[PDB]
Amino acid sequence: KQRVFIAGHRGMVGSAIRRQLEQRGDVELVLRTRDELNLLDSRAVHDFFASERIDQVYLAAAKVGGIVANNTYPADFIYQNMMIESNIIHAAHQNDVNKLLFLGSSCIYPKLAKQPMAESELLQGTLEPTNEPYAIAKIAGIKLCESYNRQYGRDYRSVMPTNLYGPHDNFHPSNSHVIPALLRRFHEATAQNAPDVVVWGSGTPMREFLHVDDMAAASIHVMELAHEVWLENTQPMLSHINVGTGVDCTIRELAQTIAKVVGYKGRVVFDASKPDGTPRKLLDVTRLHQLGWYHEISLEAGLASTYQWFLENQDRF
Amino acid sequence: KQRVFIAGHRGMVGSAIRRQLEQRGDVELVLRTRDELNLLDSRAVHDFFASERIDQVYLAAAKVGGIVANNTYPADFIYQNMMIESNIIHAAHQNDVNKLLFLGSSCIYPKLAKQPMAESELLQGTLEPTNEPYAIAKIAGIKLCESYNRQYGRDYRSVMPTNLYGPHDNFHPSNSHVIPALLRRFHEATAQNAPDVVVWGSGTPMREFLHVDDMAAASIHVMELAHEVWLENTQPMLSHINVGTGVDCTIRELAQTIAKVVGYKGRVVFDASKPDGTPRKLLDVTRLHQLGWYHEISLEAGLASTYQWFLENQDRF
Ligand SMILES: NC(=O)c1ccc[n+]([C@@H]2O[C@H](COP(=O)([O-])OP(=O)(O)OC[C@H]3O[C@@H](n4cnc5c(N)ncnc54)[C@H](OP(=O)(O)O)[C@@H]3O)[C@@H](O)[C@H]2O)c1
Ligand SMILES: NC(=O)c1ccc[n+]([C@@H]2O[C@H](COP(=O)([O-])OP(=O)(O)OC[C@H]3O[C@@H](n4cnc5c(N)ncnc54)[C@H](OP(=O)(O)O)[C@@H]3O)[C@@H](O)[C@H]2O)c1
């Protein structure tokens, strides 16, 4: 029976992986809350890895935030993520954990990358300023993995997810991520019966979204793939695998779909006097598809179920 | 032997007309798929009308969609429908086709029209924003007909159907039309044995529904009526004829009837915290009834047969 440590099991992605691994007895979960184990503490982390018998590690712990947070607390974002990665990856190796899955991020790719973005797009150009500190910490995490794989013959894999959404997301008004922000706004506009909802921009830019449950499934899939199969579809110094749908949709389509899901009857209005971001941003998921994994949750279905979760848990935001 | 061209013969309404005209040898059908004839291409359309010997035309081709589609692709909806109408109607005239039937839509009437909506309700007030582009294209199609009738002495008739349902409807999860959306939801809720099915709104608004086969019958009836009889019951600049049942029923009654048809045993729940649309929306079918046509398919019977079709074709959605 495999003993799996899911770091950051309370977070959005961490909890999703947990929900799925809990539904099978060939795995035994070892979980620690931030109060039980502070991942920033090296000694604490090494002690934990020395005391427990861990077979696999899902590194889903991180200091995550929106546009305001990343620009307001840059030092916290680069430092905490660098330490959490270093502590876990080093401790795992020191205590013979051979399997580990590192979760990166799509905001790690160059601002002006070629679309759709293949894995080789990594380090090909300057990063988006807002995400720079966080992005550097994440890239360093991938290279730590590749470096341990090379030097010690470890099996530390990594996946790069696209924009995620689903239960346990930050539905707070402070969150800048489009899906949870719009679900919230359309929910209130519907409740207060507002004549319209104004969204900044033209609505023409194209984005990609993946439901967190699909994300968890793909993660477990990549983690459990045969080592020979994984080596065959990656390179030692370009080992990360993009995880997404490969399908993009306009912000207009997204907003209009959310309006429908929520039962909003007013008008959705795009204020084109405000600037748009990059015209298009989506991942090339060829590598993942060749590894035999395809997403199951469509946008409409995922938004409807996420809204349902939001309804049962709104007294938390 | 009459040579009839049914444009858009693969669509819901188009195929219904075809099923009925196929069941009679006094008519010979000329059909072209989108790959055989792109209706947006003027030259292609005029060439087709020049090469074939068409006696009648049923203009059932259109760019149709739900709430999300109409608000997401407004330009495609107004443009494609305007071109398809213009191309066909002009080509028909240029090549001496004297008989043509144009299929409009109920969403063409003013948002705040008087109920039941008589034909004279056309252009009496502002349109529902969601349907505005599509509605303008459709109204332009009716006026093209009236204009050719007036200037060239043509016999281009038009019918305005109410909400339609039946086989070949879009049963996809993306579809916002109430009947196919509810048949699908109740089907899955019944299969997964869900305790309840929540529907947005109070369930009190009243809507009218017509089975597509009745629609096809009425269309053929109006098309084949004697010219003197048609002129007698219409006006040159108010020539369209409403096609529907003239009977309305609440959303509550509709949902409850679908639940029964599907064999659902759970509870149907209306969430009244979500807004309703207009309280009532149905057509005045006096003109059609005076022309001697009455619908044959009742709601329960039509839903049962449509569900039956859905069951045999579910591996398409
Ligand atoms: N577009 C994208 O590429 C994208 C989008 C979403 C997520 N992701 C990936 O998923 C990762 C996780 O994101 P998420 O949305 O699941 O965030 P989240 O909900 O904040 O998860 C982070 C978890 O880590 C825990 N944690 C942080 N610092 C800790 C510490 N010092 N000791 C112990 N636990 C600590 C947090 O616990 P507390 O909150 O209890 O402190 C939290 O439960 C990201 O870093 C990213 O790589 C990528
Ligand atoms: N409530 C209402 O008032 C109501 C409700 C339903 C229908 N209707 C009326 O019925 C009309 C048809 O509706 P429907 O439900 O039958 O839609 P549908 O199933 O989408 O039928 C449209 C057909 O037109 C074809 N088509 C579209 N563009 C074409 C092109 N450029 N070249 C060749 N073929 C083209 C489509 O073929 P492909 O899909 O193969 O491209 C499709 O088979 C509507 O426009 C409306 O006037 C009214």
Three-class DSSP labels, chain A: CEEEEEECCCCHHHHHHHHHHHCCCCEEEECCCCCCCCCCCHHHHHHHHHHCCCCEEEECCCCCCCHHHHHHCHHHHHHHHHHHHHHHHHHHHHCCCCEEEEECCHHHCCCCCCCCECHHHCCCCCCCHHHHHHHHHHHHHHHHHHHHHHHHCCEEEEEEECEEECCCCCCCCCCCCHHHHHHHHHHHHHHCCCCEEEEECCCCCEECEEEHHHHHHHHHHHHHCCHHHHHHCCECCECCEEECCCCCEEHHHHHHHHHHHHCCCCEEEEECCCCCCCCEECECCHHHHHCCCCCCCCHHHHHHHHHHHHHHCCCCC
φ and ψ at residue A133, rounded to 5 degrees:
-60, -45
Helices H / strands E in chain B, number of each: 11, 13
Tell me the residue type at A310: F
Cis-peptide into B116, omega within 30 deg:
yes
Query: What span, in angstroms and rounded, lies between the C-alpha atoms of B69 and A133?
Result: 39
- Through-space distance between the first and last CA atoms of chain B, rounded to whole angstroms: 38
Residue A290: burial class (beta carbons within 10 Å; 0-12, 13-18, 19+): exposed
Closest listed residue to residue B97, CA positions, set B41, B156, B145, B39: B156
How far apart, in whole angstroms, are the C-alpha atoms of residue A224 and residue B24? 62
Which residue type does A119 have?
Answer: E
- C-alpha B262, offset from chain centre: 25
Q: How far apart are CA A168 and CA A289, in angstroms?
A: 27
Q: Which two tokens stand for residue B115?
A: 């109920």
Residue B271 C-alpha, separation from nearest chain A C-alpha, in angstroms = 10
Q: Which of the residues A199, A207, A253, A311 would you substitute to probe the B interface, choosing the one with the greatest number of B C-beta atoms within 10 Å?
A: A253
Round the CA-based radius of gyration of chain A to a whole number and report it. Answer: 20
Resolution (A): 2.3
Q: Cα separation of B250 and B255, whole Å?
A: 9
CATH 3.90.25.10 fits A166-207+247-281+298-314, yes or no: yes
Pairwise CA distance, residues B197 & B255, whole Å: 10
- Whether B200 and chain A come into contact, CB under 8 Å, resolves to yes
Angle at B238 between CA B236 and CA B242, to 5 degrees: 130
CATH superfamily of B1-165+208-246+282-297: NAD(P)-binding Rossmann-like Domain (3.40.50.720)
Furthest C-alpha separation in chain A: 62
Nearest chain A alpha carbon to B274:
A263
- Distance of CA A15 from the midpoint of ligand 1 (Å): 10
Task: At B228, list the tokens.
Answer: 């003197």
**B263 interface with A at CB cutoff 8 Å:** no
Residue A105 labeled ligand binder = yes
Report how far residue A186's alpha carbon sits from residue A21's, in angstroms, rounded to the nearest whole number: 33
Q: Which two tokens stand for residue B11?
A: 């669509």
Query: Per the structure block, which two tokens stand in for B163?
Result: 């909400």
Q: What are the C-alpha distances in Å from B196 to residues A176, A218, B21, B25, B264?
A: 34, 31, 43, 50, 9
CB spacing of A263 vs B173 below 8 angstroms = no
Closest CA to A31 of A50, A47, A48: A48
- Name the packing angle between helices A12-22 and A212-224 (round to 10°): 60
According to DSSP, residue B266 is labeled S
Q: What is the largest CA-CA distance in chain B?
A: 62
**Cβ of A257 and B67 within 8 Å?**
no
Chain A contact set for B128 (CB, 8 A): none
How many whole angstroms separate alpha carbon A175 and alpha carbon B287?
56
Query: A50-59 b/e with 16+ CB inside 10 Å = b?
Result: eeeebbbbbb
- In sequence order, the β-bridge partners of residue A268 are A197
Domain with CATH 3.40.50.720 in chain A: 1-165+208-246+282-297
Q: Is A298 on the interface with B (CB under 8 A)?
A: yes
Instruction: Report how far apart, in Å, the C-alpha atoms of B93 and of each of A176, B53, B302 are.
Output: 56, 13, 37
Q: Using CA atoms, how far apart are residues B73 and B138, in angstroms rounded to an integer?
A: 16
Instruction: Name chain B contacts of A298, Cβ cutoff 8 Å.
Output: 173
- What are B248's two structure tokens? 């309305």
Q: Enumerate the residues of chain A whose CB falls inside 8 A of the CB of residue B67.
A: 256, 260
- Provide the 3-class DSSP secondary structure of residue B224: helix
